[PDB]
Amino acid sequence: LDSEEMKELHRRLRSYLHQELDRQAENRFQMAVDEDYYDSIQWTEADAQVLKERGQAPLVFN
């Protein structure tokens, strides 16, 4: 039964999944970054490198 129509259904579902993934990419990224800031990880890589060149160890107050 898979060949006749379930291939079309699977293609449709994959397209819908791609659309909902790319539509929510910004919000998904924002929620991920929020969860990262929860557990005392609050320095972006660029500014952390800037601090490292300063000789200053990055600090998180959280």
Binding site: L21, Q24, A25, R28, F29, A32
Partner: peptide, 8 residues
């Protein structure tokens, strides 16, 4: 998959 679960 998105970056979260794929990254994990």
């Amino acid at each position: 998959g998105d970056e979260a679960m794929d990254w994990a």
